[PDB]
Amino acid sequence: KTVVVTTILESPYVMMKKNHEMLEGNERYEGYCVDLAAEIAKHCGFKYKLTIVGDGKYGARDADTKIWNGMVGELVYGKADIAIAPLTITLVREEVIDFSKPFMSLGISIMIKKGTPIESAEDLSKQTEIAYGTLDSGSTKEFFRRSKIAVFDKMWTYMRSAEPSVFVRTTAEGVARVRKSKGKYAYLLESTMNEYIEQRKPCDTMKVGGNLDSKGYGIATPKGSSLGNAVNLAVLKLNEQGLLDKLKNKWWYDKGEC
Amino acid sequence: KTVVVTTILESPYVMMKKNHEMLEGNERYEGYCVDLAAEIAKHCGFKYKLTIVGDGKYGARDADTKIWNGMVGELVYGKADIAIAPLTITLVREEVIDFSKPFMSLGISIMIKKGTPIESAEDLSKQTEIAYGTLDSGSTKEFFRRSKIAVFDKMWTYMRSAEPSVFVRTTAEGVARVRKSKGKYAYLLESTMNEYIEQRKPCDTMKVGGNLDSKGYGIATPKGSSLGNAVNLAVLKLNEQGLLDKLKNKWWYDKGEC
Ligand SMILES: N[C@@H](Cn1cc([N+](=O)[O-])c(=O)[nH]c1=O)C(=O)O
Ligand SMILES: N[C@@H](Cn1cc([N+](=O)[O-])c(=O)[nH]c1=O)C(=O)O
Ligand SMILES: [Zn+2]
Ligand SMILES: [Zn+2]
Ligand SMILES: [Zn+2]
């Protein structure tokens, strides 16, 4: 009866409260997705427990073992009832789990250390001085692997063969590498996260250019789950009553340090 | 079985071609949604007929009789098998029809005659010299009817009681009203249509401000349609292959005149 919610530690969606040691259950966490979970739970009339995905991944199918990892895996193998996180709606995932309508729009975007002479993906592709990479597991990497658009395939060819690895294990690892590399590393990441990091100290990064693509984050449930329909109606309700915009502002711009 | 597709005359989604005489059937029409129809038809593998919704409406539910009109009505009562149109995904609709994931994102925006002293919704609401309204039936009018945000309810209050009616039966009628009102009428409408008009001769209007909200267009099917799942996976496939971005560029900005 208590609904197990799988999610991921990724600011500002889900963060440990300063003092989580003294708190328990859901109280240990805070963020956009924590607020959204409370709201969905409330408008669906269920009680829930938040849990952080064990392997810290979003969800991909291993080619060899054909096994699903990450949050998607937790839903597929029945370890969780619902996932509320910055989880991208994709065709390959839609084939094994259900998604609500998107609660947030976004696209792949470019993060640079301020001053870097890059204005676009095309710019990145036509040069080698400035290295670039992505979160080495998720829909961003997958976007580039699969793309048939020339500029993106050109970038993918570079990135897959670059040594040392241009790929990073976490978003933070990616930001730090931008910040620390005197403008010789650029980072391709989802626009929402780019915009968030842009308003954080030391305020030395920026988003350049437009998004390379358009997609959305959705709340996921196991196929044929009994929560799917209600959860979906809830996201639509909360979007129309302005909540989702409220929450974006609270966690992005009301907190802005720049 | 040939699939009856319901849609609506709205540029650049569905428009009559210049030479539609001597053309027959699906060939009389061109537009973003026409190309969209064809591609979905190839990827779910069916044959279809394009038909323009008889009453020229998007879809709303008569409070009195509780009957659905517009394209939504045609799905609900079994007159059409699928709507492919700039149809907004909303809560009241998702309760009686099925939507695919969004094929396009957008928001309510303001259109002015060039030179009009308005920069935002607040500006509209704080004055009376300049009249304003919406498509008198659709998701936009409903957004204002329902809004609790002070500025939008302030506008709504004015709008509902305005004389003469500031509402219009078609986008075309709204734009003509802006163009001929010498700047005394501003028009609230979806960002996609606003962006398109701004790039067309006589090039005398402009989109001012940001979007007042965020949402999507989806393809709709009757609840429990066999087509439901297939079309959904098709929209995700097209978005990921970059086709949708291709169509948007072809129809919006390769067609610019200003
Ligand atoms: N949303 C993604 C995971 N994911 C996250 C980030 N990020 O945290 O900004 C990214 O830059 N790229 C990516 O694929 C998923 O669903 O795979
Ligand atoms: N997409 C809407 C209908 N609809 C369309 C336009 N338009 O064509 O830009 C508008 O300005 N307002 C509106 O409610 C829905 O489906 O009701
Ligand atoms: Zn800690
Ligand atoms: Zn609530
Ligand atoms: Zn195709």
Side-chain angles (χ1 to χ4, degrees), chain A residues 1-18 20 22-32:
Chain A
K1 231 156 221 54
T2 303
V3 168
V4 180
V5 178
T6 180
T7 185
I8 196 161
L9 278 184
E10 182 86 79
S11 312
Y13 295 101
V14 174
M15 301 174 291
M16 310 296 305
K17 279 191 195 167
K18 164 191 174 173
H20 57 97
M22 296 280 78
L23 304 166
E24 71 184 324
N26 301 336
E27 297 318 298
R28 284 168 296 163
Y29 312 105
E30 68 178 345
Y32 178 96

Side-chain angles (χ1 to χ4, degrees), chain B residues 60-118 120-130:
Chain B
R61 173 182 157 287
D62 188 311
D64 283 344
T65 64
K66 300 181 162 182
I67 288 178
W68 283 94
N69 65 22
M71 296 184 284
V72 178
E74 300 197 1
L75 299 183
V76 163
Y77 300 118
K79 298 308 158 50
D81 304 321
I82 199 177
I84 308 202
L87 189 56
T88 309
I89 298 164
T90 75
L91 175 56
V92 287
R93 287 169 184 175
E94 182 83 303
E95 302 187 276
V96 301
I97 60 171
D98 282 341
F99 281 100
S100 78
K101 298 298 193 294
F103 64 77
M104 194 179 297
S105 305
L106 66 292
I108 297 164
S109 61
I110 311 181
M111 170 200 280
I112 63 163
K113 182 155 175 44
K114 279 176 168 176
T116 300
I118 293 291
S120 68
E122 294 201 342
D123 287 356
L124 277 180
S125 52
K126 290 175 185 294
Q127 62 73 56
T128 57
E129 295 182 343
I130 298 164

Side-chain angles (χ1 to χ4, degrees), chain A residues 89-92 94-95 99-102 105 149 213-215 229 232-233 236-237 239-241 245, chain B residues 89-91 94-95 99-102 105 143 148 213-215 223 232-233 236-237 239-240 242 245:
Chain A
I89 302 169
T90 76
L91 161 51
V92 293
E94 184 79 296
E95 285 181 299
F99 280 102
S100 73
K101 302 293 184 293
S105 271
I149 304 157
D213 74 353
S214 246
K215 47 201 159 193
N229 177 57
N232 190 46
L233 293 188
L236 293 180
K237 180 103 153 191
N239 180 62
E240 289 161 8
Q241 305 203 320
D245 308 321
Chain B
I89 298 164
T90 75
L91 175 56
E94 182 83 303
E95 302 187 276
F99 281 100
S100 78
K101 298 298 193 294
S105 305
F143 169 83
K148 293 155 182 70
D213 76 349
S214 183
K215 42 191 164 193
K223 269 217 168 182
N232 194 27
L233 303 179
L236 295 172
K237 180 102 171 183
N239 187 33
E240 291 181 7
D245 289 290

Side-chain angles (χ1 to χ4, degrees), chain B residues 182-226:
Chain B
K182 296 174 176 52
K184 294 309 170 189
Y185 183 83
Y187 185 54
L188 294 139
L189 84 173
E190 286 166 345
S191 63
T192 45
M193 261 56 72
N194 200 346
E195 296 165 11
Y196 174 80
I197 296 290
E198 178 195 326
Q199 293 319 314
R200 309 283 294 172
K201 305 164 66 186
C203 308
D204 64 327
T205 60
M206 64 176 304
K207 182 190 188 301
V208 288
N211 298 351
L212 285 53
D213 76 349
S214 183
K215 42 191 164 193
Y217 294 140
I219 294 158
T221 45
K223 269 217 168 182
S225 171
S226 67

